[PDB]
Symmetry: D2
Subunit: 417 residues, 4 copies
């Protein structure tokens, strides 16, 4: 009944919990109730998902499309008004595990969410060679998420004035105070700027504790630019990101300046281990690395893509561990080097250098519990109380270390043919 | 067999190195318990779900040492009015507001009479590196591959390996005695990596016959280029090269997008062109194409690591209409790497999202048309994403 | 002494008098107060040199230090081949010292390579590279590709229309019509496969063709214009926005030139005996390879280079280009080079070296190669002017010489850096 | 009259005679008989021009056409400033025509810009661009950054050690010890913040400093060599692999030069009224923006350019570089330019134009600027040699003049592309 059902919705202590599935759907189709009124009216999250699927399904060319998209018994409360909207369900990505990865005297079992055949198996083989080689070592070389707004002044002489002002000790200090006032972990490092006529691109860089820090840095960037407006009232803020960050697009600035964590990792693989585990020789590995990862990438016109498949490992760890998998674009930046080592140049020195690993252990997908499980496997879930940023640094080191395992195994598979 | 043993006992054997199980879901349980013994926090696994998932479609083709699955929330943006049709576009993401913003982009496009798209090129690639004794020899091979007779014999060998192996023009570059060879072929509705690899191996094997001193150094010399940033994918395309466009009436930019045509053009020029230029970008002349590509790719069983190149996009915005107040927007994405059969599209949840869009599996009438359609959907939804985010930045 | 402007104009407009019957003071007087603007001085003054002399006197009064031009030479230079062709508002010439590096043993021949440069030691260093190559049996090179390009941008009303034009150009019959219009413009105009790129309703079209021994810019542009006119017959709503849309790409760095080639794409190589690397180059093979990998490959990669995987190819390209009447601004793309070094031979102690240069933009007819001094340098190499019995051979040979001299230069400088002064 | 070889040698080794007492034919007879190496002619022959003359006679006999050097001039040129400084094995000089575009109205001054080129209409076209700027009220420019660089590669035993070295150079005291070493080598050496990059056990170190009015390669390199010697005292396992590891980056295309700058980073701007755009440039502001956006931004984007967002900056950079005694091979990076074009005024009919050139590598002291003809062109612009009272001002002014003349070039070519035919 259409007019009885409205009575049960309007009563403040009854609610739509008393109504049925088809009755709420009869209301919308008759146009008694608009569609957008169902988000706010319906009580529980899972029933909101159910009714959206049903409404959505009748509009589809094949109304049975959603049959095998699962949606029941998922914690939508951590996702609603925080991570996803118009939610009709969830997508299971198989999670495999590669390890142990022997990195800086610890051992890691690395979760990898992927649907590419053999990626975990191959990565795990690279892990095996590293462990039988005495483990890999890594260092975090730099740390600071960025945002890169574009501002505009009337003339290029003015934009130049502002650049010189931001380069002074006094002007930087003023901007630093306004940026840092927005948050606990927001500490502004040296500003990088570029002029293009009357445009001025300003790359704000700051650590962000254990968060990846896109939201924190943005908040700092806006207050900092508000303070900059007080010194330069004619300055227009065109966009809070003018693509100079650069976020989720290939850019040499991230390659050269770094973004998020800049990391290096390295290991030596005995000749014996290269033969028995990797089914090739040190000399063959080197020849392939030089001519694939340097020369080949060079011929193809690569900026920052001097590696075999860093992106595969970055992406799978990112999906498993609640990262922004779109940031695989810049986070997969990697140069993989290989050279002969040891008494008779028969052992394999390998290193991966990844200048822009954009990563966090708090916020975003890491609020969700399956994603926290994977972060917990690695011992890096959430914030680190004693050493703010140490969980995010550790995960970045794991990523780089795991990328190196991936590089060893794939580069060996290609070398053996 | 194993059904009479217990979980605690079978692990006893694998630990002792004296060592399959009769049910897929139990194989996952026992793997979780083996892994569990190696972690400092074994209870970390308890909220990583694993039950009642169809592991049969995974075991052999997709993933090894599987211990569960990672649920990614799926949202829907649409209807996206694209080429006289309506699509409800699934987007798997954990990024706040990404679906809502994309959906707004869709709303603006529909009220502007919808978007139009064309597939400009189509062919996955693979770019092996080979070596000859001398640069004079590598050059002889290049010359030979550029003749009609040479290309035809390399084509016959490539094409013999499978149904959809149909070799297009070759692209080669020499680096001294190295020769990089870029094979491009369509691949039915599959993304086509395995297919083009098999075609490449038999083609390189046939090239070895003409040049026995040639060394096949690696079936991928990074000249493809797969999953790394490369100008070659931007200039030559890879997979589907696609263009999409729409005109958004002035009032619609005002009321829906909360800005103006003029302000939008000013941000696009100075962010997506000039800004990306100052940043030293090749192919990243867009706001956030990667957000949409990645979200759709995870939802639709694509290889999410191919967002590196699939996200390549130039977003252009011009003034339009008689009064010059309407917003012409286009997105050009020359390297969308995509398929509707194989990989993660073999799993039922991922197929649900492909079925939403009406592109699931092979198009039996016209091989490749579902993958082509999906690329067009990706490019149209990227343009929707560009519209909304650029409006939010300009406002 | 100078008589009034009125009388000076009557003598100027008389056929049997002209400018020969006036003073320097009097020509300068007419210019200072219009009647003669300044650029018309070339087509009015008795001789080329007096036109240059007068232009200098005009300029000198405008300067802060009037005697600035004292040591800028101008007398007795053959300005006839310059005027209307190479340069306007000419006040003189700039002497660039020319040294010789050689013999360069390339493809079983010997070359004495002229290099116009002011950088100390460049010719000496390059010359040592030639010697190391000579003692190692010499270099070999092949020309891989040959075609100068021009990359106009056109526009259709919509992206779907530009898509239609791309597909039409990709059909055999569409390209054959465009090729016919292109090729009708000159005897050397032969259009190769078209490269096309869409950016919304924009459509960049890369026209490529050999061009005899000319570098070919003017010829290609002419071919391009007739090709687009014909294209407009089929697609009347097409607008030519610019005859170059930076898609060629000329005189700017661009991945397309690196990947597709432009002008002449060349490869060169040589094996240097271990003995020679030690004695001549003061280093070892092992050391050279380590420096090359970690400087020219890894270092160039960390700096974010496209096409710059070399030590100083640009030094050599520029010196040969100025010496040989080339367009030195084309150093931008023509310097593209990847230098590779590896172990070779029985001992694995000999140095294999190769230099691959995909975009050497060059020619032996036209532009600066019309002037006799730069023809002298071209004649040194045996590549001056057009080749009658094999059109394009001289420009191809010059491209090979450039790539081989670059390799010579790479060998030497890389050995200097590898030794570290020692 | 030509004497036997043994007789000619005693004359050559007689200290109160020498080669001055031999004829050309005798000196050649000695070279051909392998008594004198051909390269030692420079230090044996008393006059520089005679050394050039004999090198030419020797060279001509090696050529397939012996008269090929006829129209290569060599006489009455001042080889004294070139020998052992600018060029070796010298057989003459190459005259490049010099034209003048101007006046360039820049920062309330006027410049007559010399351009050594052989490309037809380049000077005339650039000169049209100058007219538009001057009738548009002039151009204004700013040097934004100043510092030549050198980017050596060193190697440590492990990547962990390269990381240790990077962190050490990033502390204020580690940097200060390196800065003290670097600054000690020359009066203008002032080491700026160190930019470093790791690749495994490689460490690339980008040393940047002002260099007076010199372009500064040799100076920066000398400071770099001494700075690395100091760093070796703290890290004795460090290997200096190469004083240039291509991270500078000198004379190759590189994003690092685009993003960080190198030498002089400059920006230039003008507003061109519609009337001037009409009469001088023969077009409209609307047409020029449409061409600039779709050629210099979008076109360069599709071509995969880094730093090549301009029409023909390189033409102007190269022409001025040759005239003014610069290193013309550095036009690779010095030509880096993004040209921007906007509508201004009430009906979008005035043309705001700017050129941004982040890496103008230039000098007015040293190299080819030591030669008198090259100094004449520097003197034309008022930038010859070192500025005593304001060190670096001449080099800074020249880089502004390049950027401003580049903008002039951009205006004219783009206008011509916007019209047709
Ligand atoms: C990592 C994955 C699994 N993988 C890929 C696909 C990698 C792509 O996703 C990225 C590349 O396209 C990037 C690039 O190189 O340009 C390939 C492969 C790459 C390019 C080809 F043309 C063909 C095959 C190979 C491979 C297999 C054989 C011989 C050569 C290469 C493997 C590979 O690593 N398998 C493996 C190893 C050990 C074990 S084991 N025995 O340890 O379990 C199993 C499988
Ligand atoms: C699309 C996403 C959700 N989004 C992002 C994050 C996008 C990043 O993941 C990619 C960028 O970093 C790439 C780049 O531009 O460099 C931002 C944003 C971007 C850069 C900042 F510095 C700060 C915030 C914005 C935004 C919000 C406000 C004002 C300006 C920008 C939005 C955005 O589109 N929200 C939105 C719009 C409508 C509705 S509605 N009214 O339809 O529901 C909801 C949310
Ligand atoms: C070719 C030129 C002359 N040349 C240059 C300057 C080359 C620049 O124009 C381009 C580089 O900057 C490009 C780069 O590497 O990034 C340098 C040099 C390069 C970078 C430095 F940091 C310092 C010095 C060297 C050099 C000398 C010694 C030790 C290391 C390098 C030489 C060089 O080749 N001299 C030489 C050799 C043999 C004979 S001989 N004995 O054969 O006549 C003479 C001179
Ligand atoms: C500057 C030079 C002289 N110039 C060039 C050649 C410039 C090349 O050296 C570099 C370009 O290739 C870079 C690029 O755009 O990709 C061209 C030209 C460019 C691309 C073509 F396909 C064809 C012709 C043009 C031109 C002529 C006509 C119509 C359009 C463009 C001119 C040009 O500026 N002439 C002129 C102007 C005023 C006066 S006046 N009347 O003031 O004296 C004379 C001549």
């Amino acid at each position: 009944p259409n007019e009885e059902c409205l009575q049960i919705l309007g009563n403040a202590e009854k609610g739509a919990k008393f109504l049925s599935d088809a009755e709420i759907i009869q209301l919308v189709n008759a146009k008694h109730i608009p569609a957008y009124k169902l988000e706010t009216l319906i009580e529980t999250h899972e029933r909101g998902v159910s009714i959206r699927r049903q409404l959505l399904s009748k509009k589809l060319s094949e109304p049975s499309s959603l049959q095998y998209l699962p949606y029941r018994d998922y914690n939508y409360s951590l996702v609603m008004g925080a991570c996803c909207e118009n939610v009709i369900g969830y997508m299971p990505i198989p999670v495999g595990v590669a390890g142990p990865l022997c990195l800086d005297e610890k051992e890691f079992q690395v979760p990898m969410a992927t649907t590419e055949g053999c990626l975990v198996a191959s990565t795990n083989r690279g892990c095996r060679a590293i462990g039988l080689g005495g483990g890999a070592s890594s260092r975090v070389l730099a740390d600071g998420m960025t945002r890169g707004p574009v501002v505009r002044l009337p003339r290029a002489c003015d934009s130049a004035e502002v650049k010189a002002w931001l380069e002074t000790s006094e002007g930087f200090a003023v901007i630093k105070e306004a940026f840092d006032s927005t948050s606990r972990f927001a500490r502004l490092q040296k500003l990088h700027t570029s002029i293009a006529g009357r445009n001025l691109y300003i790359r704000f860089q700051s650590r962000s504790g254990d968060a990846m820090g896109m939201n924190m840095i943005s908040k700092g960037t806006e207050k900092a630019l508000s303070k900059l407006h007080e010194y330069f009232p004619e300055m227009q803020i065109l966009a809070v990101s003018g693509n100079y960050c650069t976020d989720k697009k290939p850019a040499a600035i991230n390659w050269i300046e770094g973004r998020g964590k800049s990391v290096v990792c390295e290991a030596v693989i005995p000749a014996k281990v290269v033969r028995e585990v990797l089914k090739t020789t040190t000399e063959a590995m080197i020849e392939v690395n030089i001519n694939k990862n340097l020369v080949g990438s060079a011929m193809a016109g690569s900026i920052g893509g001097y590696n075999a498949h860093a992106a595969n490992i970055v992406t799978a760890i990112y999906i498993a561990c609640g990262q922004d998998a779109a940031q695989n674009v810049g986070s997969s930046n990697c140069i993989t080097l290989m050279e002969a080592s040891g008494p008779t140049n028969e052992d394999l020195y390998i290193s991966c250098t990844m200048p822009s690993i954009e990563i966090g252990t708090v916020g975003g997908g890491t609020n969700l519990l399956p994603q926290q499980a994977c972060l917990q496997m690695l011992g890096v879930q959430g914030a680190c109380k004693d050493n703010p940023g140490e969980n995010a640094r550790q995960l970045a080191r794991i990523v780089c270390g795991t990328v190196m395992a991936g590089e060893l195994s794939l580069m060996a598979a290609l070398a053996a043919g």
